[PDB]
Amino acid sequence: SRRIFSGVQPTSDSLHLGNALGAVAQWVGLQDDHDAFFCVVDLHAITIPQDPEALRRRTLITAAQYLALGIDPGRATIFVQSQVPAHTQLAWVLGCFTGFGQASRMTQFKDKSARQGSEATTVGLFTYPVLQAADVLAYDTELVPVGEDQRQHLELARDVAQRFNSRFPGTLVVPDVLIPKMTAKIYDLQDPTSKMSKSAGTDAGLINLLDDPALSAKKIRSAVTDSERDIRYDPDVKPGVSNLLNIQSAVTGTDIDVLVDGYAGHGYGDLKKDTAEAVVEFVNPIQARVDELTADPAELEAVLAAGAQRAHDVASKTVQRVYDRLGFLL
Amino acid sequence: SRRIFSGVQPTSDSLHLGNALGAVAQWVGLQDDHDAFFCVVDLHAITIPQDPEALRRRTLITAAQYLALGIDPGRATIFVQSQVPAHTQLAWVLGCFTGFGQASRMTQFKDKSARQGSEATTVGLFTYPVLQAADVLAYDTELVPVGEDQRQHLELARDVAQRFNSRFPGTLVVPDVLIPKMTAKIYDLQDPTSKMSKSAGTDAGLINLLDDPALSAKKIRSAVTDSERDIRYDPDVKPGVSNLLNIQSAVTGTDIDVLVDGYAGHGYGDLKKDTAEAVVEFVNPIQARVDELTADPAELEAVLAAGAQRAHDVASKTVQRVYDRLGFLL
Ligand SMILES: Nc1ncnc2c1ncn2[C@@H]1O[C@H](COP(=O)(O)OC(=O)[C@@H](N)Cc2c[nH]c3ccccc23)[C@@H](O)[C@H]1O
Numbered sequence: 001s002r003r004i005f006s007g008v009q010p011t012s013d014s015l016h017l018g019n020a021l022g023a024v025a026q027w028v029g030l031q032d033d034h035d036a037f038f039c040v041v042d043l044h045a046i047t048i049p050q051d052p053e054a055l056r057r058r059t060l061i062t063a064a065q066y067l068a069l070g071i072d073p074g075r076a077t078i079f080v081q082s083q084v085p086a087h088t089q090l091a092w093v094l095g096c097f098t099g100f101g102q103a104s105r106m107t108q109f110k111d112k113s114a115r116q117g118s119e120a121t122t123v124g125l126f127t128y129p130v131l132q133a134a135d136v137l138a139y140d141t142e143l144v145p146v147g148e149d150q151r152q153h154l155e156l157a158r159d160v161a162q163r164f165n166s167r168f169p170g171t172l173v174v175p176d177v178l179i180p181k182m183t184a185k186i187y188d189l190q191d192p193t194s195k196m197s198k199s200a201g202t203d204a205g206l207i208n209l210l211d212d213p214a215l216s217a218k219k220i221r222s223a224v225t226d227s228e229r230d231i232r233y234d235p236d237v238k239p240g241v242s243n244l245l246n247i248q249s250a251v252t253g254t255d256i257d258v259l260v261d262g263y264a265g266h267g268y269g270d271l272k273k274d275t276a277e278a279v280v281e282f283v284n285p286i287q288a289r290v291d292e293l294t295a296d297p298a299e300l301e302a303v304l305a306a307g308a309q310r311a312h313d314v315a316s317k318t319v320q321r322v323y324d325r326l327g328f329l330l
Numbered sequence: 331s332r333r334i335f336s337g338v339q340p341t342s343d344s345l346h347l348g349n350a351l352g353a354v355a356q357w358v359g360l361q362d363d364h365d366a367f368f369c370v371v372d373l374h375a376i377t378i379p380q381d382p383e384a385l386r387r388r389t390l391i392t393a394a395q396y397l398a399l400g401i402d403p404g405r406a407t408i409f410v411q412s413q414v415p416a417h418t419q420l421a422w423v424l425g426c427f428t429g430f431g432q433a434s435r436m437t438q439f440k441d442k443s444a445r446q447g448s449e450a451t452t453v454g455l456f457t458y459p460v461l462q463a464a465d466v467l468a469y470d471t472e473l474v475p476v477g478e479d480q481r482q483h484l485e486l487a488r489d490v491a492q493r494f495n496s497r498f499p500g501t502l503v504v505p506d507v508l509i510p511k512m513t514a515k516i517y518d519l520q521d522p523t524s525k526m527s528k529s530a531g532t533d534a535g536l537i538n539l540l541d542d543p544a545l546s547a548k549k550i551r552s553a554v555t556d557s558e559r560d561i562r563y564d565p566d567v568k569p570g571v572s573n574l575l576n577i578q579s580a581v582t583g584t585d586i587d588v589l590v591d592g593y594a595g596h597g598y599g600d601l602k603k604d605t606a607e608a609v610v611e612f613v614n615p616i617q618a619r620v621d622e623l624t625a626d627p628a629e630l631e632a633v634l635a636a637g638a639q640r641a642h643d644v645a646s647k648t649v650q651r652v653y654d655r656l657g658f659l660l
């Protein structure tokens with residue numbers, strides 16, 4: 001109990017600082033006293049066309065980064081979404097309890113639709129949050145740790161679970177949403193008002209965990225700041241400075257107000273230099289672990305096989321409970 | 331091979347003459363030389379709210395009517411849609427290859443949306459044809475026998491299969507659509523220009539297989555005809571007369587032109603009387619078999635268990651083929 005669920009799409013060869021600090025860092029803090037299911041969501045990945053060889057490789061490398069970021073397979077369950085049929089079974093049912101207008105109002109859908117273009121927009125891009133709701137509800141999940149960009153989808157998940165329970169009392173757990181304050185949004189280093197994301201345009205403002213560390217350090221030294229020459233935490237008026245403090249605090253464990261106090265009299269050169277140095281120290285051990293998990297794959301394959309078995313054992317019972325309440329012949 | 335697939339929704343306590351003559355009659359003719367999968371589609375049924383006790387009972391009674399209409403479990407596979415997870419797995423994938431505009435243009439969606447009302451319209455009503463495409467493609471289906479009302483959905487299924495195969499050559503079988511000419515649409519007896527359907531308003535023009543036969547005979551004697559006093563086959567100008575000839579021909583096996591020739595000099599009283607008598611002879615053996623399958627349920631439960639096992643063995647391999655082509659970790 002204190003059951004928790006969270007997922008990441010295997011859409012690129014590396015997670016970025018947004019994923020690591022907005023999500024996985026909180027997962028690591030929760031796994032020792034929460035029963036945790038961490039998922040690589042390859043079914044969601046194909047809502048955009050994906051190269052098959054890359055998709056398989058990136059599924060593994062995403063799970064590898066979980067382990068390398070501190071996720072403990074002795075304490076948590078790591079598995080691949082497509083390997084547990086219950087997700088799509090529950091997604092079908094929950095679609096029958098999701099409003100069409102409700103789904104069309106999701107920001108992601110609109111943004112994603114704009115990038116793909118219309119009549120090229122597919123049903124899967126539209127039903128995305130219904131499958132996401134199924135991912136969570138299948139495990140009787142009590143809490144979902146994510147970044148801010150996932151909030152609207154999880155509010156749909158809660159709404160749909162409540163609507164289902166309205167007709168079938170007590171069937172699904174309504175999950176609580178757990179979104180950290182400081183790292184809810186890590187921002188792009190070149191446009192500190194946009195969240196760090198792979199669809200940025202160029203990756204000059206994007207910090208990939210597995211990129212050459214000297215390259216990430218360069219990007220950080222080039223981060224956009226302001227003209228004030230005052231290191232002070234204020235996301236609204238000082239986006240780039242605040243984001244750098246956020247990042248350095250998150251990867252070092254030093255509170256911001258302590259960093260800010262310790263930065264009195266310093267310029268932005270030292271803020272960027274120190275943040276770059278802290279990030280390099282952060283990613284070097286991650287990369288070492290990921291390299292070994294990739295070169296010696298049997299360990300990670302055993303973890304995913306074990307995780308799929310345990311995820312199937314839990315999620316299939318949820319489906320049978322839901323199917324029984326609906327009145328399906330069993 | 332000559333693999334065939336078809337389904338009926340368990341949405342009422344009885345099939346009607348449309349279902350029996352537009353679909354199941356052709357199934358019976360195909361099953362001896364075609365490898366056939368006949369499905370009770372309970373996942374589709376819940377795209378509209380369903381009473382659970384009724385839904386379970388009607389799932390059984392729909393499968394019972396298959397057997398009572400002549401479907402042979404020694405030659406064909408009968409099973410319940412929800413009992414085979416592969417259907418929802420493939421539905422998710424096919425949604426990723428279905429256009430949003432494409433789905434919104436389905437007539438059923440629009441009609442069904444109009445009856446349910448908007449913002450009360452759900453995602454499942456919208457994704458209905460994607461799951462229907464999955465039902466068919468999961469079994470490498472070569473031919474699909476249905477009535478005319480299913481044509482537009484199966485053209486989507488073919489379009490989506492072709493689009494998928496475009497990226498992943500040779501993965502899915504593109505099915506042919508098999509829609510009979512004479513019984514493509516059985517029309518309501520009180521409004522012979524509308525197809526016989528449960529959403530008619532009143533059931534005075536609807537012939538349920540399992541209704542009291544004297545009641546169905548009454549409805550037929552009250553069928554709307556015309557003022558011509560000439561028994562002649564012409565669906566466009568003589569809808570009610572043509573529909574009655576269609577029905578009597580289909581349940582007796584007598585060709586229409588032979589019935590029409592034999593009706594020279596007769597009025598519509600004899601057309602309705604004879605059609606009512608033929609329908610009573612048609613439904614009485616069906617009802618006898620359905621009553622026994624309901625009172626002694628172990629036989630039908632064994633048929634559905636066997637069918638689900640065989641359907642799972644086939645459809646799960648299709649899913650694994652599709653998953654492999656997409657590049658999912660297996
Ligand atoms: N710049 C950023 N700052 C802060 N946090 C960020 C940033 N970018 C990403 N995140 C967080 O990282 C996690 C994974 O993001 P994805 O885009 O893979 O995230 C996604 O695409 C989801 N649909 C995956 C998903 C599928 N099913 C689920 C069930 C529960 C939770 C999540 C899921 C997320 O927590 C996200 O909030």
Ligand SMILES: Nc1ncnc2c1ncn2[C@@H]1O[C@H](COP(=O)(O)OC(=O)[C@@H](N)Cc2c[nH]c3ccccc23)[C@@H](O)[C@H]1O
Nearest residue numbers: 336337338339348349352353465476477514515516525526
């Ligand atoms: N008045 C009529 N005249 C002639 N034929 C008719 C009439 N009314 C119904 N039919 C036919 O009966 C079958 C079942 O209809 P449903 O409404 O259950 O049919 C439905 O609701 C489908 N979505 C079920 C389905 C789900 N998956 C599938 C895959 C293949 C084929 C069918 C399906 C159909 O063949 C239908 O054309």
